From a paper:
Like all Apicomplexa (the phylum to which Plasmodium belong), malaria parasites move using a substrate-dependent mechanism called gliding motility, a sophisticated substrate-dependent form of cell movement based on a macromolecular complex called the glideosome. PfMyoA is a tailless myosin consisting only of a motor domain and light chain binding domain. By solving three structural states of the PfMyoA motor domain, corresponding to three states of the motor cycle, we show how the unique class XIV N-terminal heavy chain extension and its interactions with other structural elements define motor function.
The crystal type 2 contains one molecule per asymmetric unit. The resolution of the PPS state is poorer, but the electron density map is of good quality and allowed the entire motor domain to be built, including loops with good refinement statistics. Second, the interaction between the Relay and the SH1-helix is mainly hydrophobic both in the PPS state and in the Rigor-like state, with the exception of an electrostatic bond between the RelayQ494 and the fulcrum SH2-SH1S691 that is present in the two states.
Residue numbers in the entry: 2 to 720, 727 to 768
Amino acid sequence: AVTNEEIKTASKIVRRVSNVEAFDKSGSVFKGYQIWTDISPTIENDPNIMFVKCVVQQGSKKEKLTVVQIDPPGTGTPYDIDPTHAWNCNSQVDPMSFGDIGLLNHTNIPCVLDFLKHRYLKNQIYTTAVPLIVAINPYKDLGNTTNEWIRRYRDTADHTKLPPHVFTCAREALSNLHGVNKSQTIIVSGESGAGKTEATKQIMRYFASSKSGNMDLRIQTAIMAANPVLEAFGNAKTIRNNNSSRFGRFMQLVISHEGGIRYGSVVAFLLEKSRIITQDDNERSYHIFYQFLKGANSTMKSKFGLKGVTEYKLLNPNSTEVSGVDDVKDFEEVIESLKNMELSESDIEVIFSIVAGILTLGNVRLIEKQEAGLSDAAAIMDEDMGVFNKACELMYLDPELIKREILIKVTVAGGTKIEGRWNKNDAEVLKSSLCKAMYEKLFLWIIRHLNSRIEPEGGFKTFMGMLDIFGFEVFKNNSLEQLFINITNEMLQKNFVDIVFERESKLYKDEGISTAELKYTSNKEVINVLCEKGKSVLSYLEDQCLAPGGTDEKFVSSCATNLKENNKFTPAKVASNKNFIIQHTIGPIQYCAESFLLKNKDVLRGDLVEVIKDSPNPIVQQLFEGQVIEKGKIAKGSLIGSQFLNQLTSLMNLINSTEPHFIRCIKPNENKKPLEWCEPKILIQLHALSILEALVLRQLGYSYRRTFEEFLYQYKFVDSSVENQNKCVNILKLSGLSESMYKIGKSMVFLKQEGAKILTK
Ligand SMILES: Nc1ncnc2c1ncn2[C@@H]1O[C@H](COP(=O)(O)OP(=O)(O)O)[C@@H](O)[C@H]1O
Ligand code: VO4
Ligand SMILES: [Mg+2]
């Protein structure tokens, strides 16, 4: 389904640069000119398609062109349109012959759509946008990922012979890393479900493909067997995709030339704790629960006291079975994938005992009481007490101590303590927060246990970076988690434009700036409205959290007044008290605030942490390990969002250092169906992944760039301080290039996409 909002957002992107020169010099009009048009009942009746192909009929003027619809099959009726609505077509070409869009004569919106389409439906998804690699999602296994296809890339000697691929950007990066001994990073970008995880899995498998049979299994073995476990605990079924990464994945990898992983680092960030507690309908919790509850052996089941996937209140009993997902099979895989991380039969037994714990604690009914002369007072339900006692046993903590930290408010004046009781609402809020913590920190501990065996003896010098972020998400409900997810993405988009469209624009201005006709990404306007310390959505949520009386509406009002003067922040038209639109790269995204404060405050702290700290089980002790208690008033550092900004900014800054290798995934249709083309949903991504500009300004702009000394070296016969500047201009005028093809800069020689190719004989 394509929203009329997705239709609007895509219709804005529609731009007409080049003119339709479709008339024979004399007259009679050019004989059968293929063009594109926004006008046709075939565009009106269909939302999936935006343009039809037409043949320019003989006897039309440059005011109204009589055109007949060729593709899609037209009623054969010639209709008249203004040249304003006619784009130049890449008349008679074979989209399969060349694996780079750069070779296209015209690279207008309709032409890139038809080019990527005539490939996607032909089952060639990957194309080079230069630098970028556009990798569409065909939803079906193509088999162009296999060890056979891996070998074919790594071992094949010539780099030009190699067609566009994920493996193309894997060798491209691995070669530079070993050759120029500079640490390189692979950026995976697109929608939440466009192909990030898949490409990341593929490129990992590629670096795990060894030529030599010498290297130690241990490190590589554990790293690859981490991916299935990481997904069990870190991925869940969504309305957008049935395996959505609810954590941002980052890797640092030491891979020796002969395709072997010597060392690695696994860092996951920002887990979705609101997954474990509740799930949207049609949506689900983290795979692990389901896999466990199903494929658990007779004994585990009885020992833990496991029930059905329906019988656990934390897990939605309607959305339990995933369309085309066999949870028992994946569980079996997840169990071996754990052993293959140096986790013993006991270590596993514990992981699942805690998991069984979280579930069992989430079935405990808390109730209201008139108790201790407090009323509204927290008290565990009489019957559900047995549940709670095993629930704690399973987590390996004292039940009556967890019972004491929930149900009892503990305050301090001076060096002296004051008792008091927790209320039903707040006790339930705390009971939930215990589960959230246990889960988040167990996953984090498994990541820590993996890193303790895989990380380098010393540290990381030159490594291979890989980023499996959570892509842009749009629904009906858009919470703080959904806001964080879209903030993360916006950073990975400015990271890109600063490297791809800014270093360029600077170098032109530093030498010979040809066009003021360049980049289209005003990501700075939206990255500031969201992160800029003091004045931003996050900074007015940060301040509001540490405020005494801080309401969700109080935070909304501060943005609706302070950030008003900006176009990127738009307040809601209806229910303006709660909702607000943030005009993203992918377009207008609206957030219903509500709980925003408590969600940013959703982090376990206090004397409660200390209970888990001195647990009998060591894994449970280690579960928190490095934790600053404070037991009271919250800090700026302890805030969920405020920690995330620090986390993203720090990690992103390491990436800006390493060599950027961009992979751009496109989701062709929401329908989760192979070989289905929805032009508007795609067009939005062509704009956001900046693909339709990263070719407009690469082909229109100068692509060579070499200093006088570099240029004059290839023409050996010549050799000089200001004279060698004029020496280069000669070689060019002699070779045959027009004064438009080349440009002479303050220190270098710029040569166009087409020009630079001439001098290569
Ligand atoms: N190149 C591909 N070939 C086949 N299926 C793919 C491909 N890329 C993605 N998919 C499918 O699309 C699903 C959603 O993509 P996913 O791996 O979760 O990436 P992301 O991190 O963007 O969500 C995958 O689980 C897989 O079924
Ligand atoms: O769907 V994602 O794995 O990109 O979050
Ligand atoms: Mg993922």
